[PDB]
């Protein structure tokens, strides 16, 4: 006499909430998925938008670049 498990109790009790699939799923969890491939969820964020004027005149290195030359 073999006792059931958590998967057999959840699959047996949750199914009653064809009936032969329960008789086939009583010994082992063939109907339900015991092993399923799992992968982490991937999320993509919208890329940052920077204006052309903010790119040309944006950085402070282009204004002081000659002053930075004098720093070197």
């Amino acid at each position: 006499y073999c006792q059931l498990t958590s998967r057999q109790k959840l699959l047996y009790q949750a199914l009653k909430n064809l009936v032969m699939q329960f008789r086939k799923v009583c010994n082992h969890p063939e109907l339900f998925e015991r092993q399923e491939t799992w992968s982490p969820f991937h999320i993509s964020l919208k890329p940052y938008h920077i204006s052309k004027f903010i790119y040309r005149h944006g950085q402070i290195r282009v204004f002081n670049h000659s002053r930075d030359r004098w720093l070197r």
Partner: protein
């Protein structure tokens, strides 16, 4: 039926601030009732900020706890209008171990002010009927829209961008002629026939290639982070940036001044808002004065619920929890408590906002609860009363159900009365 990120709060029941061309507030407008002088002064401040011809002015809001001045502040923020800079912060939020209090407050003054810059760029968009590529590599594609049909030839880089993202026959996409990034907006209904089937977009209309003027507003703190850090998006979104040098900020201020002198771009003053300023350090209290005395400063409004109280850090008791130096720097607008006649009106409009059907005896007894106790407690009583009415299955809330909820939840004064009897058993009385 779906639950949006936003849910009904205390300030969410009102939308906008009701005013008139003569600045005479209505008794009930835009969900707000009463406080004629408060809504008039706040309307004057709103028209001042909408003018935006001056800079570096402060105005304070004062009133008793429960007067809803925070609700008129959030309602003023809603009535401010889109595409205008606004920032909401609290007095306790500026304290952080990662960044100094002065760099955090100055960071708020930077986030408040913003700049509007307009550009023009050539962008192609439309449905792609066919694509051909021959491998340098030479290929040609067909761009068809409802109005016209065109054929284009691609270079090496364009062929690389095409082979990077595969596009099938008859797919509506947007091709940028500047960067070279191809983005597929959708698939045509007729061309998408015969896959994932993610989305469907109709064929675009108009000219294929147009020059669009892009209106883009950037923040001074955003530009300052972008320039200071190697990657300002990773610095700002990561939060690792802090203690930015003031020399770079001054250079950016001079360059923005040069931009305004050129006239190619314009600067838009922002609206800073500070909550619970009754408790704050004299370092920030003193720094607000000079920060407002700076050339370019946003227009701010601060809320203080408490009255005369000792400020934090010193043993001196300041009036209104603020030193006289900052008190004389700004103007104060005091709010009066709500009238009994306005209380039942607020209760009724909260019934309309929360979709609750009550009776006149319910509004009368709840009005008594508003007379003996603060209105917020009654607003918290009706919310739990609707559910008890649902358990009673009745289509209208009853005074008996209001008595059941009133028996379930007790006021702070009552909990104080029982806590006086059980206080000896409580720890550290």
């Amino acid at each position: 039926d779906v639950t949006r990120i936003e849910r009904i709060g205390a300030h969410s029941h009102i939308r906008g601030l009701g005013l008139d061309d003569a600045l005479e507030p209505r008794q009930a407008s835009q969900g707000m009732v009463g406080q004629l002088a408060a809504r008039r002064a706040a309307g004057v401040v709103l028209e001042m900020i909408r003018e935006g011809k001056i800079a570096g002015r402060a105005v304070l809001i004062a009133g008793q706890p429960g007067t809803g001045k925070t609700a008129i502040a959030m309602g003023m923020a809603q009535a401010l209008g889109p595409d205008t800079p606004f920032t909401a912060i609290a007095g306790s939020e500026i304290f952080s171990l990662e960044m100094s209090k002065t760099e955090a407050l100055t960071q708020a003054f930077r986030r408040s002010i913003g700049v509007r810059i307009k550009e023009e760029t050539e962008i192609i968009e439309g449905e792609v009927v066919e694509i051909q590529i021959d491998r340098s590599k030479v290929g040609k594609l067909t761009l068809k829209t409802t109005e016209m049909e065109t054929i284009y030839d691609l270079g090496t880089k364009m062929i690389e961008s095409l082979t990077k993202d595969k596009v099938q026959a008859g797919d509506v996409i947007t091709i940028d002629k500047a960067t070279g990034k191809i983005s597929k907006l959708g698939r045509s209904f007729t061309r998408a026939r015969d896959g994932s089937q993610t989305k469907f977009v109709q064929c675009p209309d108009g000219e294929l290639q147009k020059r669009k003027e892009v209106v883009h507003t950037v923040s001074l703190h955003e530009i300052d982070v972008i320039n200071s850090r190697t990657q300002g998006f990773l610095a700002l979104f990561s939060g690792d940036t802090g203690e930015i040098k003031s020399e770079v900020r001054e250079q950016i201020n001079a360059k923005v001044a040069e931009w305004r002198e050129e006239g190619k771009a314009e600067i838009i003053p922002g609206v800073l808002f500070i909550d619970e300023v009754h408790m704050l350090d004299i370092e920030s209290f003193s720094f607000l004065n000079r920060a407002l005395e700076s050339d370019m400063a946003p227009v701010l409004i601060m809320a203080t619920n408490r009255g005369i109280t000792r400020i934090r850090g010193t043993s001196y008791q300041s009036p209104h929890g603020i030193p006289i130096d900052l008190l004389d720097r700004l103007l104060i607008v005091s709010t009066t408590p709500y009238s009994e006649k306005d209380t039942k009106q607020i209760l009724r409009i909260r019934c309309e906002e929360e979709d609750v059907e009550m009776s006149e005896d319910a509004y009368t007894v709840l009005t008594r609860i508003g007379l003996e106790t603060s209105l917020r407690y009654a607003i918290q009583l009706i919310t739990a009363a609707s559910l008890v009415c649902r358990k009673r299955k009745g289509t209208e809330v009853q005074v008996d159900d209001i008595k059941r909820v009133y028996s379930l939840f007790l006021d702070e004064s009552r909990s104080t009365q029982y806590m006086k009897e059980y206080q000896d058993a409580f720890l550290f009385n």
